[PDB]
Symmetry: D2
Subunit: 518 residues, 4 copies
């Protein structure tokens, strides 16, 4: 059959593997959301329109670069591209906007004739790392300047300094009033303003800088839906982000980025107070050995799956597509395996920010994700999500597991749920139904935010409330169905599970019913 | 409480190791009890005791007694049952089942006579021989016996305690050596294992008895000696179109019935493992194999299965059962039987209410000891994909009930079918079935864990109100009967429009 | 098709049940041991020979009844029946003898009398009942129940409790002479042992009994007291603790740790706790003994009706089969062999039910869970054992042949519940008899003096295991066999597993 | 803790994931074999010694390029580096040599010149042999004449490993008129793919036959057969290998749609499988390759046969010293899939970091092997494997079971052909399988089996066979202690047979290392 149904029926996992078929075609409804980083290559309204058509669900604003007005315009261009489809409300796709904070970054300085200048740090060389503003524009083959004054106090003799995504390596030999004398361990070529990593050194930069508070308040005052909080090391780092957003930003989802050894080891306490997680493999693969990142990835996704909270896998997923129109075999493998790992979202960075094929990269992620979602061994995944989820007396969670068990029984095409904040939809999403979870909401922000929950397809209902409440409920269900037929999710003859509550307002989801599509 | 550390276990072995004798069963008893009506259990006042003890189905054994006798049984059972209708929140429906005589073979005619082991014995069918059988001649009321048991075959008399080996097909009978001597009363039952009996699948007496059951409104027929699908059709023909609502439980009693089981189960409403006859027809050490096989396949099919015969046999004379009898009851419940049965323990024994009480107490403990983990998983994985909204709602409701350890699943049903579809996934939570059909209320006693409630008030002017007062009726009866407490969660299962077949809704509610 | 192999290969338990087949014939070798009680019905040498051929493996001497010389005559008759087959070394079946201790038994005195319900009776005739437990007047408070005769008789103590307990018959019935008395729910004082039990135990040591069924064991101390009273020559005698009351069940783990094995004594246990809960105690105890690798015995009223009837009831056949399915190593006949009219028939019945039931075990899941639950081990005997059972399941080997001195090699194979018969070849006469407690072990007593070179003495015992197996119908010319041996003489060094074709 | 055994013991797969720990070091030796492709960057003896030291187990000779004498030179340098470590018998690491055939390839023509094909320019594909040397920005020549009649209008023609694409505008007399879809710099003699086309090229060309006979006479251990479509193709390779090539292992490369759908019949007649992801990702949608990889690894694991994952595992390390996140993740996930081997192509044939690429695969494989959920894997392999009466497989599964029970460090097995080692490896023990053999070829070939560590025994036989048996066991122990697989106080399982010669394995022992 299609959607790898024979591999879904399998006795065992081994026999499930043996029955996967390249000829079996998947469902149109791709359920892992795609996050695209906005930059020069993806900033135009018309480019953004093609990225929404290819499947982008979350636009990422990287506040490591750009002014407040630069980002204000990209927010504007995105909202303009998005609302361009609002005329046909049965196809309208909400697109969320995420603010990715700069955080405690450390960067080198501008070199000799700044523009495009290159300097090769020869292996075996002596190089000085300086924090004197005189040497800030002074970069050469024996001098590097950094924007971290206290670097001279936290990197001991014998400590290793990484430059340019870890391809350059220095080892401190002496400390002096002129800075730190280092012997180059791993040479290479050095541009301007490259990131620096000090794994193991006790960096004293605050988790939330003075500009970060400014950036967060910007996002509140421009209406961002999601904050990606960089270099989160502890539960108190999430609290600072929460305070910074203040009462006006209480509705904003905080995804903590796990980027170093501390964040991995303090993982459980970070997840407890976050809304979700980003496995930030770039920084992570410099901070810990590269052959261990996948362990960190598979652990955090497992624990996020268990807890029911969104997990994002990020960085170098389709790296070569910066330059080439087709990805490497390792790159398609990587996207597929993050979907099979259980990730809710996958990310593109340079591939959409500055490469020559941003729309093709999104297309590629969409096509790989549809095949991989079909190849999940739902039989063991659902059974294990059931056993690991504790007993509950909340009617929303009880209705939710009932509806997912019901959806597997009839191979339902979808589970239509009414939700004010998204919570009813997220509780469905955490049992990983194969049926699409079609969330009908009046909340524009909730429509956007549910893109973090795998398998939730948001629909923004906008018609005004009807006189009788039960008629308003029925109308939104009918909106779910006809949006779903128009988008290819549903066909006449399908069964659908419909989830609703007994009274208006959030928190009262308690009804599940089985409907045939006529 | 309720052996849930054992229900929590990751493996069956760990599950056994964690069973606790000091864990009391909170749940109500879910396996129905059938009691056979006889001289020990016919007075209105005795029946009342037996109802309170827990009897859910009364079995009329049509192997004995005149039609007027069984009409008296029916009238007495109904009087004792309606004795409680004045309090509708606690009224227990009780089904009435008619057990057919069948293709019985008996010997000829307090009085006794011994047949010596190794004796030479004659079997003949001659009509004047019928009157005086001696220690060397046995007469049977089956003429074709002389054609059906060839040389070397065995003839069993009196519950298989006496056997005979045929040596030659004589001219005026069958010359047999006694293999197992014993002392033989008058007109006792004969079994012919490994014999092709041409006796009709439904005799003319059975047809009169099934018409009687229709006229008197029995809910259930236990059809004796069912060998093939066509035997069920003869029963369904004798019941006629007027008896279409009566459930047919086929009694598997011999080797053929075991071999043709799949074809029998498919045309029946359910099965009775009749271990008495079956343990004569096949070696006694094989009955448990047949019992577990048949309970298994009925479980897979979602059809009722009854375990019957000698479960508490010693309680005919003694006030306490043996250790083998208590484990037999428990193990039939563990196997997955929907019903367990008493025959002589209630028909003629000295302790009929005690035996009912013993089964009820054993059923409660054993139902708690079921390894629900592996069972619900295997049942949902074995059950095929369904597009029927009633079945889809059922499994969703059962999964929801396990998630919040709901005390009850309250369902509205007209034919019982929605209750039965919940029953087949074996919820731990009670299935409380609210129906206006008095007959359906009696018949769903066949399904394990269904507790019927007969709603008596006329339909409210607004249907949605009629549904809600039925649901509240389920809640109020539950609280009175100890199934529900204030603050519990219940799952409520209904349909989107009146009439049967439209169940499709599942809600979670908190009591009060 | 045979041995219920379709049901054994099913992927789920439910499918396993659905595939069970009344027409699938089982293997000749029954693996659950049969324990028969000796009594008037089972005491003649001729009869005992017939019971051995019907499959008795352990003969139980009930020291609750009879005198010391009575029991020594039983032992002599047992051994004369057993040793009548000793001219046949390849078919010789060891038969163990087990001493079931009297223990803290309370019995009435000395014909028959009826006790009407509501009557006033005194515990010191129809109104008087004598008891052989002096401290009963001190441990039964007022309102406390006294059960007599398998718990059929109920009594409740009146507020008078001085020179004899004045009582009220709570459940009337008929009372014989010297019938048991049970005092549940009231905390008792009677010693763990007695002078009779000590001397009974010592008599057991003098006459070479192999096993002790220790009555009414509620603590580790009881088992130590039993092993103490058995004396320095009493080592080597296996001690089965009989769990008989509420205290012994809930302190089970500390008892099993100290004991060689367990007997679920449902007779008394069904009086001491509600009868509805015995099956819980039975399944809990068999599971825990299975998890521990220690033999468990299921006992009492298994074929009760066969005391007077040639054919069991449907519940009795069911109960035997379900004890075997639960995992019991042994099953017992008490009155059915000791005093009834059909002692050989009752042994034949248990033998026939057990063979059917053993094939109907869902081995696939049983083996998996026994593996997962058994801990890691650096003992080469334990490592070789689970290797060999796993190898046995892959080739459907007819048997695992094992050389053992103490039986411990055989017991460690047996704890993984292999389907293949474990054929244990030993020189220790007593060990050959004691391994009947372990399901699946078929002991062979090797009688030859040792060969010069130890490696030829090993091959010879291995072939002795083959030839015996072929003669008895365990093995045949196409069967594959696993041979488990050791790298040096003396017990404790098992470490080799070989796969061989039985020529 | 170590070896991820908290995650190994978890009762569910989800819980096993949750317990994976980056601080848990792998102590088991590396079990997935590393195959390195020889080329300019890896043909010096000096670099080959560093690659053997970093982890290389098999050297791949790519017969798509280079003359026979070129390949004889590679073989000779490989052997010189490998025998540079003989003379220390307890640490000598065998290295197998594998011959990767050319197969039915399709190449463009001769143009060191380069031509740019620009996006949306119109290009002609011609077979006309006059144009064999006249290629430019709008005409391409291909060595496959029937390409005119098998590519319909609108079909696709891929050049340059799928980089450049051509949609057929029109078909005419001069050839196929096409337009660039994606342009790129087109070199001479580049590879061409025809997805969804009928290519009737023979499985075995004459030069392939010539190449196979070259490998027999130079004693290669393995043949990687390109573009296997059917069982018939494997028989042709075995036939061309001749009577002297009896003992050569044939790994079938699955490269296109047909080999995937005829996989079972190909698997039954092959010694093993390579997922050839480069060609395969051009012939089928790139989004479907992971499916075929996982299907094929599963079936080979089920069948107990070696499976190789290949192509672009560490591709960025051709020019960069450190791989990308996707690349490390890819290697880890191939080991977790169950691959017996992982492969390097341009990373070691031509890139600038050949030794480091090997090192990186070794370090990733070690972390991944410990992250295998052994509990479910061994259980499923047990019940999935059929009942057997061969005593070598009965012993193997008994020995693998015993090994898990005592957490043995090693299973020492004596083997002549390698078969008894392979029958242990198919049950995926965590304990290393230390295989002692006198057969130097078998020593090289069992690198195909995950978790097998070959030791080449060189002493002459002893007069009494029992003594010869046991000093071979002792050779494995001492080799194991020297290498770190084994330590005083460990338990090992020893697998041996009852009679000399192959096929008679049937004994398993548990012994303490002293
Ligand atoms: K950032």
């Amino acid at each position: 059959q299609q959607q790898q149904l024979p591999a879904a029926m399998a006795d065992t996992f081994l026999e499930h593997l043996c029955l996967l078929d390249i000829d079996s075609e998947p469902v149109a409804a791709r359920s892992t959301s795609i996050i695209a980083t906005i930059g020069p290559a993806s900033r135009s309204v018309e480019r953004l329109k093609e990225m929404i058509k290819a499947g982008m669900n979350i636009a990422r604003l990287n506040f490591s670069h750009g002014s407040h007005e630069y980002h204000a315009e990209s927010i504007a261009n995105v909202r303009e591209a998005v609302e361009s489809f609002a005329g046909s409300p049965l196809s309208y796709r909400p697109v969320a906007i995420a603010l990715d904070t700069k955080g405690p970054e450390i960067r080198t300085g501008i070199l000799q004739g700044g523009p495009e200048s290159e300097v090769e740090l020869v292996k075996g060389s002596q190089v000085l790392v300086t924090v004197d503003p005189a040497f800030r524009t002074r970069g050469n083959a024996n001098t590097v300047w950094v924007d971290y004054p206290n670097i001279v106090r936290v990197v001991p003799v014998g400590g290793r300094i990484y430059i340019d995504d870890g391809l350059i390596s220095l080892v401190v030999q002496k400390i002096g009033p002129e800075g730190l004398v280092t012997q180059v361990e791993n040479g290479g070529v050095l541009g301007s303003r490259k990131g620096v990593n000090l794994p193991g050194a006790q960096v004293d930069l605050p988790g939330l800088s003075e500009q970060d508070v400014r950036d967060l308040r910007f996002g509140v005052e421009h209406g961002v839906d999601i904050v990606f909080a960089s270099f989160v090391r502890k539960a108190s780092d999430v609290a600072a982000v929460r305070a910074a957003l203040g009462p006006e930003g209480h509705g904003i989802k905080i995804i903590s980025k796990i980027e170093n050894h501390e964040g991995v080891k303090r993982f459980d306490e970070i997840l407890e107070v976050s809304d979700g997680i980003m496995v930030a493999r770039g920084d992570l693969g410099i901070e810990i050995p590269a052959e261990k990142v996948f362990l960190a990835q598979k652990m955090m996704i497992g624990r996020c799956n268990l807890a029911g909270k969104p997990v994002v896998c990020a960085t170098q997923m389709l790296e070569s597509m910066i330059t080439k129109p087709r990805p490497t075999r390792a790159e398609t493998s990587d996207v597929a395996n993050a979907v099979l790992d259980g990730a809710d979202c996958i990310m593109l960075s340079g591939e959409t920010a500055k490469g020559n094929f941003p729309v093709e990269a999104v297309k590629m992620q969409h096509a790989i994700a549809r095949e991989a979602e079909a190849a999940v061994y739902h039989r063991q995944l659902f059974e294990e999500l059931r056993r690991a989820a504790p007993l509950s007396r909340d009617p929303t969670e009880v209705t939710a597991i009932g509806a997912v068990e019901a959806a597997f029984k009839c191979c339902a095409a979808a589970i239509i749920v009414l939700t004010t904040t998204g919570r009813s939809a997220q509780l469905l999403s955490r049992y990983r139904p194969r049926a699409a979870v079609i969330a009908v909401t009046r909340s524009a922000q909730a429509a956007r935010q549910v893109h973090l929950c795998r398998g939730v397809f948001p629909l923004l209902y906008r018609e005004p409330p009807e006189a009788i409440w039960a008629d308003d409920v029925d109308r939104r269900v009918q909106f779910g169905i006809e949006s779903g037929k128009l988008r290819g999710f549903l066909r006449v003859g399908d069964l659908v599970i419909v989830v609703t509550g007994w009274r208006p307002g959030s928190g009262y989801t308690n009804i599940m019913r089985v409907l045939s599509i006529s």
